[PDB]
Design a protein around this ligand. Sequence first.
Ligand SMILES: [Zn+2]
Ligand SMILES: [Zn+2]
Ligand SMILES: [Zn+2]
Ligand SMILES: [Zn+2]
Ligand SMILES: [Zn+2]
Ligand SMILES: [Zn+2]
Ligand SMILES: [Zn+2]
Ligand SMILES: [Zn+2]
Lengths: 203, 203, 203, 203, 203, 203, 203, 203
Amino acid sequence: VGLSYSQTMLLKDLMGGIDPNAPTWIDIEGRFNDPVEIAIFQPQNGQFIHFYREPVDQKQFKQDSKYSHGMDLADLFNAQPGLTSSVIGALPQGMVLSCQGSDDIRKLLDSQNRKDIKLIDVEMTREASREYEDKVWDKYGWLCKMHTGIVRDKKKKEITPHCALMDCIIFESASKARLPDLKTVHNILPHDLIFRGPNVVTL
Amino acid sequence: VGLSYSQTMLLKDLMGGIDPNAPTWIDIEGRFNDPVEIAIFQPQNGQFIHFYREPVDQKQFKQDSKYSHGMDLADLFNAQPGLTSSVIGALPQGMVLSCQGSDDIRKLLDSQNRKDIKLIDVEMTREASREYEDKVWDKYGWLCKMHTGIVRDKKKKEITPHCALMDCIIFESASKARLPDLKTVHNILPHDLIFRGPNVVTL
Amino acid sequence: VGLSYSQTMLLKDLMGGIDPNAPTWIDIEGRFNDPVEIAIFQPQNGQFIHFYREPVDQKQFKQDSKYSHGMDLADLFNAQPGLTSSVIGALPQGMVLSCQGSDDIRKLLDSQNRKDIKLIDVEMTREASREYEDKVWDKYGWLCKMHTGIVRDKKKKEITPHCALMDCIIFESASKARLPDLKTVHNILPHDLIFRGPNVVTL
Amino acid sequence: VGLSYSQTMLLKDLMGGIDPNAPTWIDIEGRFNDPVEIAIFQPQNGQFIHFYREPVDQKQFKQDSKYSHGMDLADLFNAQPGLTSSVIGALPQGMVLSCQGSDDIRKLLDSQNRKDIKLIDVEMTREASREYEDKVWDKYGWLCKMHTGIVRDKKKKEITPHCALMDCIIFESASKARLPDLKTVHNILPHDLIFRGPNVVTL
Amino acid sequence: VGLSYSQTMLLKDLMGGIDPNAPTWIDIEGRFNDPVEIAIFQPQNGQFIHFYREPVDQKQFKQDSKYSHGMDLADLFNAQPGLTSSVIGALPQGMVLSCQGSDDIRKLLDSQNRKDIKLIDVEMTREASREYEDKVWDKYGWLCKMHTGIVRDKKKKEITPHCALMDCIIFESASKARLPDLKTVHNILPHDLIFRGPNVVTL
Amino acid sequence: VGLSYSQTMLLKDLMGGIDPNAPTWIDIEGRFNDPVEIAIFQPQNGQFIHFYREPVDQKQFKQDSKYSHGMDLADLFNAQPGLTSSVIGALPQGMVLSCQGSDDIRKLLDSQNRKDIKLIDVEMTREASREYEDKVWDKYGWLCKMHTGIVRDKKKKEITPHCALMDCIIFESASKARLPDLKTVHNILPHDLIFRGPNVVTL
Amino acid sequence: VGLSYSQTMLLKDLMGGIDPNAPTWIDIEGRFNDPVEIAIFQPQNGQFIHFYREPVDQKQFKQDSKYSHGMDLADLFNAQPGLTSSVIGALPQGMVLSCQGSDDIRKLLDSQNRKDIKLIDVEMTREASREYEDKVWDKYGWLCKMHTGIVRDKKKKEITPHCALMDCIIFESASKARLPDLKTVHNILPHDLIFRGPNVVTL
Amino acid sequence: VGLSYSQTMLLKDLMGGIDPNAPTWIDIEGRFNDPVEIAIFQPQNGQFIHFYREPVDQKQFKQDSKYSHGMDLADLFNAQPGLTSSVIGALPQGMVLSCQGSDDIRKLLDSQNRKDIKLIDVEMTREASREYEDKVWDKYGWLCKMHTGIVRDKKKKEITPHCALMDCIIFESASKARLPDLKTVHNILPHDLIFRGPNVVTL
Ligand SMILES: [Zn+2]
Ligand SMILES: [Zn+2]
Ligand SMILES: [Zn+2]
Ligand SMILES: [Zn+2]
Ligand SMILES: [Zn+2]
Ligand SMILES: [Zn+2]
Ligand SMILES: [Zn+2]
Ligand SMILES: [Zn+2]
């Protein structure tokens, strides 16, 4: 379906937690046209938005699963449709978003008619990536148990998967030379908005 | 598609005009599962909600067009999808709605998970229908130019079509023995929300 | 409902016409999870299986109708439920099926637990598609009068719809550089098995 | 779901054991519209059909459990759907079935469009019921361990439950003044057809 | 089972958010020996602990469901066992907890050998209860959609159910004459710790 | 029960003595699914973990008692439940464990989610076993007084029992051609964690 | 455990169906000391005994699964213990059993102290094996759905698994140059004796 | 092991001597969960069942030996396993058993799933105990030479041990004010069924 009216009213309220002037990270898995996991993280307060999307192109998903995110199609069948378009639509106006590699994000933001949003492509050395990847996945990896597959590189070497939320925390760590010390870190989105149990139908 | 996030934010604002305690009429054309025109009229202030929906079942539409509403499929291709589900979702909590023949309305309200809404089936004599039908279509018929087809009865007799908005004003007239004297009567919904010019796409 | 016991007994008999070693084409309209028209064609004898299915996802159907098959929901309400699962279940063991683009067929055959069935993805040039499309729709297009809608491409150009049965005959033509000269070509399935007039109810 | 195509093909084969001219007993537990256990017994050869059905009306089941069959809802969740409708549709044409109290059976057979089947209401004295009930439940009661609840009468007196299969053997005993001496007595239906382990889904 | 070792390590970390000197509310549904829903709310920061427990006594649950909380047994089958004993065990030593009616809480805390914890029985007028109940269930009621049953009083009058988390927010409102204005309010416990998807087994 | 919260907190602290990079031995008595005595020994520092578990299968225990470990059921009734699952969960990450015969250990480690743990199957000649068995049981046999039964081989020959802790010291001796000279050798686990005096109950 | 007293009394009764003078086939999977599936088939009447046993040696089972029977350990955990020893003990005295390759059967019968039983090693050509294997697995393969694994030969060629019951029917076919035409073929053992749902414990 | 098939067949025959309507005594030594000697005595005919069981809990046995029965572990190593569960399983249905102190017997009968058996707790004065104890141990004490240990009371006073069989004869004496005059009194169980010489092994 899409987001229902009440779901959209809730979303409006939850997005009230997002500080529009706060420095903010964004990362996705999948392509701008077919993203399967979105994460928006505000390090200052530790608030983040994190959800999933079932892929349209099943073949590419499987390949993107074996070589980057390692996700499973079965875990995505219940993701609430409309979330990507509604969270990107609900983002405040003129928000400055930080990312790693602006190319994929800009295309998605543009295809959702959100050109008002400026992007900060932050550069990150592979050395700095290797440093915090393991530290982040240990302190904060309980937030996403969705990467249950083996990801290998061109050289068939098994590698740590990418998580978008974990990628955001890694990015913040590298940009700050300090893994963030955050007491409270939480998703503004409830589990019943991210996933779909009962059925609602639009007209 | 569905109603976009901004469209839904506008709707929230416009629905602020609807007085939840005010006596209110509702009528539709088409069946609960496939309605093609919805009207919600508050006689006290003269505010109303009035929009259209493209039918799923094309064959039934044509038959319902020759025998009740006389609408044309071509005029419905541009109706904004999601309007029926979003206006019914936005209707204030615990609203008492008046109608003629509660059977069709209740089913629609229930299928949109809006059981909180109570209905008042108001009875109307055919004599009283014949009285105000012509008077309403002359004072207020400029509000809906959507019935451009010939409607006939079982006896192939050409009859005045039904308009839902006009039906609401007729119902109010019969229930009050007075065609309403209303200076200001207007749709809370703008023409660009009722119809779809440019293109927006959900994810 | 599903296929009744007697309906299934008839099916068993009619499927006796299908030659298991014969070269055989398959095509569908709609997705593996929600197919709305299935065609299985054996060019050697001219026998084919051809039926419809009402779609679960009404929104996608409409979009797939405007951009590929041009079907009408109203014509699908009476399709006999259970046909897709029962015809795929009844297909002879180890049948080698030819198709255009194996991705969609394999998923459907797998979701119906029919992995025994091997697929031959036959490649077809658009030039060869353009050649026989019109010739097939003229000699054999009377077999399917179900595409009563306008289908347009990305460039709003009105295009010939896709029919699965017609697609099978087009595929055979391109693979053979000869539109088939077939005196007898017929559906093994009767009109009362493809569609549902009276009512039977399972327990 | 319903019975799959292969399941129905197996059923066709197993029903080949049923002798159509053989004297045959039938009994159910639950009402014609909501039966929870069916038994069809041919005393001559000792072959029988015996299966279960999850009840639709949960409240009535519980009451029918405290006052007749003493069954447990939890044991019925895995009964293979479609069995009642498919076993009744597969019964030989014009089969003469014996029963105790034709009223409930006729309604069920009629609601499954099986009017061809004639019924013999055999009368049975309560004295004769009391005689073989205990003898049957001891020699043949190992065939149904599904009655794990306490059944009481109007006078709160704990009574032996009713089993449909056991009821059939009791009926045969009373009609013959001899508890049947049967070396081989067996269900034609396998445990995997009566109950559902893995998952199959229709389209 | 119980809480696994890793689950307990996570819990230790999440409980680090609980401020031991902060004023804190507690409420349960069900009895000290058989509680089915626990809520611990710290109004200052808006952090709370909120989870469920499957009841041992099924009959009492149903009665407590018809007359207080209106919960459904089916929604409790997947609650993570060991949570009640482990969250009560993890609470800071000498914590001062506020409640409504200390009798039920003290017994539970004592039966979990947590006598170090002092209780503040805060008195609340029914007038003040009636005031904030509706306001809380509207602003914060999206946090628990577990009360899907009709609760009636001695006079068969349908009444608003009790939610423990909602009860905590109502209690804070009455004690402060102000419904709390809280931007961030969230459960310290993740959905996968509150509920049980995969299987772990102790030795 | 299981390990309480405080017990688990203590365990976390005691496991801090285990050096994760240190060479480490493991041995059990009983099968992976039903182990009755576990020993984990780090020869470098002389620290070890050593505890017991009451067997589920009483018959197999008795047979395993007459032919390997010679233990007594009565001494196992007070072993603290949850110890096996909690010590295996608390083992440091990426611990390389040495053993004799990796088959039984791997299965147990895979019963918990500890596949991260690699195993070194060290080969040991019976000649080398016969050498240190007596020397170890004399210098270190006071550490385990739990083998109070007569163990015989296939030839009814009374043989020295197996102790897991003693087996670890024997294994280290054979792998090093030197019975270890260890001043300080001690269990990191206290007697009150290995055994259960008072009563704690989970919820 | 073992077979309970009542279970053994039932067995005594069911074994009354076995005709002691009837020609009878036997086959097993696994070794004499560790058999995992036993089948005893009397072609004359079509009666057979067929059950499973959980293997002691888990490693050998897996290898015997990849190279002969293709069974899964998980399906054997619930097999009723004691069945092998009790069915071999209940076999009529001096029964002449036919088999393929007497070596494995004799050892098992001897280890169960049943030397009274004579064996007929019937020779079977691989040509004759290849003939009926497919025919038997199609007419009678619904009797055993326990071979859910891929079995390959020395040349990594995927081959049809062996089923003991199917092997018995294949053996009878080859010895008779006719696949048996059997209306009634059934297991004398009920599903609740072959598998273990509830718990009984010996002393 | 357990009782073999032949052993169980013999038992069935010997239990044919037990008159199900006859008044019958039962007594045990050891607890319901760990009984070491069972006696079932029918005074009318003088038939009795009397056997032993090796204790699981060795420590409790020794204490129960010093303070009640005075038995020796060494004499119990050869008791035939499975006897307790098989004799209790074989007891005729609906047998009214007399005992002294129903608490221990009921628990044992229930743990062996024999609730059908009703118990008569017969009261006995210590005066009446002191009267027949010596008379019974002299006329019938040759039936049990198993109490070869010194039993003392709380006051270290050496007392006559308890024998279960002797206890049954004492109970009958007290209930009848007459030591029974019985020419023939004998165990229905043979010495080779009560004790185990050769070896049989189950599968
Ligand atoms: Zn992720
Ligand atoms: Zn109109
Ligand atoms: Zn078509
Ligand atoms: Zn029954
Ligand atoms: Zn709640
Ligand atoms: Zn030891
Ligand atoms: Zn098999
Ligand atoms: Zn004695």
